[PDB]
Amino acid sequence: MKVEEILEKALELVIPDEEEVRKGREAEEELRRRLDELGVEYVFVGSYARNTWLKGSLEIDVFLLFPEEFSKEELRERGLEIGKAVLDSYEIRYAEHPYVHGVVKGVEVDVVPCYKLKEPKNIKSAVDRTPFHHKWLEGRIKGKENEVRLLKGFLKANGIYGAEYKVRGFSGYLCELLIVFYGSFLETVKNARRWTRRTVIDVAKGEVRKGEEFFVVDPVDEKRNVAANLSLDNLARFVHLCREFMEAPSLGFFKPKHPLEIEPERLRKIVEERGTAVFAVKFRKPDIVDDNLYPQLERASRKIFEFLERENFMPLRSAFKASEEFCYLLFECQIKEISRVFRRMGPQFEDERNVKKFLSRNRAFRPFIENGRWWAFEMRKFTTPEEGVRSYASTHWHTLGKNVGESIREYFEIISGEKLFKEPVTAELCEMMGVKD
RNA sequence: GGCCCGGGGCGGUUCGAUUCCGCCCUGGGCCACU
């Protein structure tokens, strides 16, 4: 409980055992043969090609190199023919461009078509940049593969390992650039403790500077930020995590935390103690990939949060959860109920025109003067957070994300109390309210 | 699909909106999947 001690024991969790290695090697062997019998020009890339893949994440990436002149359609058609002839089982997949995923001797394989080019310039799509990323990394990360694995294991165990929207963490590529930069997991963790939201790490220049945002420049393109999708808060969590690790090394930082399920009854009591209004907007999950849905859940969540603050319900925090079946937007407010009346600021007394206009409005309670200007008492259409949101969501469904909104437009409800504690959101609620133990 | 910058139109709210809440056209940049 020295560092060195823990890291040795940690390699145990991050490095693939001999069976997983062999299993992959054997598949690479077969995959090459099958590809050669067809005489296809390919190149293995990704963490597998560079022996940096984390334990239990064995997947082989094979990029097909096509002449700079082929049409985008040739690549897809030809790419599909090859993946389809070479894989034990396949399944077309999509993204920037379509490609084929599948299996071979029991291991996940991605057969991706891209253009074979020289010089990062003339890149038509991200998939074309991948080969250069691989070439830059292959000779430089050799020997530090386990350092990469410790870093990956660390991030994964703390819920910030991938760069996709459901996570907004650190991509695999980013991890390797960091190891290349600092030389090891420890040096990376030691220095990350000094990272700021203004830090800029330029790998190719072997330099660190102050910029306008956290930026890790791509060795293959200076203009690209490899950490582009690492959220501000996730950056912070990492920095904090490193400080804590160096202050008290523990194998715990590499072991996923137990969901720590709680009994709803206890949750009910805690919410009672807090005296807040806790509720959730429930609707049906649109049939879209997490990549389109999560940013939508974030938007919808925010727009409602903002509605809650300007409408003065004093929201504390918000959260959200997606199930196979529905999606939940969670909220906690300090105000369970507010009065019907509120005061509206009017014009300064000297402004006769607007004053006369301001008094023309027929109201229930007769305006008054205070510190030089007129004020009027007004009445709200709703006096509870749940009421406001029911109103907001029913009329502002369109500003809650193209799909999420369209779904809420056809059906939503607000849940609170016992009926809420029964939904698959109890874990998100504890996290949101800082429940501990 | 989401986010950033910019234009052309509107609706609602308000004493008063370019400036609050939103809606259509629309130009550029960027992010995630591969």
| Domain ranges within chain A, ordered by starting residue | 1-15+144-259, 16-143, 260-339+384-437, 340-383
Give the closest residue to B34 (Cα–C1′): A95
Asked whether strand B has any atom less than 7 Å from the CB of A215, the reply is no
Cβ-contact A292, A236 below 8 angstroms: no
Per-residue CB contacts under 7 A with strand B, chain A residues 170-199: 171
Binding-site residues of A for CTP: 47, 50, 133, 152, 161
Asked whether strand B has any atom less than 7 Å from the CB of A93, the reply is yes
Closest nucleotide relative to residue A126's CA, C1' based: B34
Binding-site residues of A: 47, 50, 59, 61, 110, 133, 152, 161
Q: What element of type H or E holds A109?
A: strand A107-116
- A72-80: long-range contacts, CB 8 A cutoff, minimum separation 24: A72/A97, A72/A124, A75/A113, A75/A114, A75/A115, A76/A113, A78/A113, A79/A111, A79/A112, A79/A113
φ, ψ (nearest 5 deg) of residue A337: -150, 135
Asked whether strand B has any atom less than 7 Å from the CB of A94, the reply is yes
Cβ-contact A376, A363 below 8 angstroms: yes
Level-2 CATH architecture, domain A16-143? 2-Layer Sandwich (3.30)
Cβ-contact A344, A378 below 8 angstroms: yes
Asked whether strand B has any atom less than 7 Å from the CB of A299, the reply is yes
- Kindly give the residue spans of alpha helices, DSSP state H, lying in A264-289: 264-274
Binding-site residues of A for ATP: 47, 50, 133, 152, 161
Determine the Cα angle at A55 with ends A50 and A59, to 5°. 55
Q: Could you give the 3-state DSSP secondary structure of residue A206?
A: coil
CA distance readout (Å), A95 to A126, A132, A133, A286: 10, 20, 19, 18
Q: Estimate in Å the CA A313 to C1' B21 gap, whole number.
A: 17
- How far, rounded to the nearest angstrom, does the alpha carbon of residue A61 sit from its chain's CA centroid? 23
Binding-site residues of A for Mg(2+): 59, 61, 110
Q: Estimate in Å the CA A343 to C1' B32 gap, whole number.
A: 45
Instruction: Tell me whether the CATH fold assigned to A16-143 matches the one assigned to A260-339+384-437.
Output: no
Which residues have CB under 8 Å from A435's CB, separation 6+? A262, A267, A270, A429
How many Cβ atoms from other residues are within 10 Å of residue A406's Cβ? Answer: 15
Experimental technique of record:
X-ray
Handedness of CA A176, A182, A183, A187 (dihedral sign): negative
**What DSSP character marks residue A54?**
P
- According to CATH, the superfamily of the domain at A260-339+384-437 is Poly(A) polymerase predicted RNA binding domain (3.30.70.590)
User: CATH assignment of A1-15+144-259, given 1.10.287.130, 3.30.230.10, 3.40.50.300, 1.10.1410.30?
Assistant: 1.10.1410.30
Q: Could you give the 3-state DSSP secondary structure of residue A236?
A: helix
- Resolution (angstroms) equals 2.6
How many Cβ atoms from other residues are within 10 Å of residue A142's Cβ? Answer: 11
Q: Estimate in Å the CA A406 to C1' B25 gap, whole number.
A: 21
Tell me the C-alpha distance between A413 and A427, whole Å. 20
Handedness of CA A38, A43, A46, A52 (dihedral sign): positive
Q: Estimate in Å the CA A199 to C1' B24 gap, whole number.
A: 41
Q: Estimate in Å the CA A290 to C1' B33 gap, whole number.
A: 9
Asked whether strand B has any atom less than 7 Å from the CB of A376, the reply is yes
**What DSSP character marks residue A327?**
E
- According to CATH, the superfamily of the domain at A340-383 is Archaeal tRNA CCA-adding enzyme catalytic domain (3.30.70.1550)
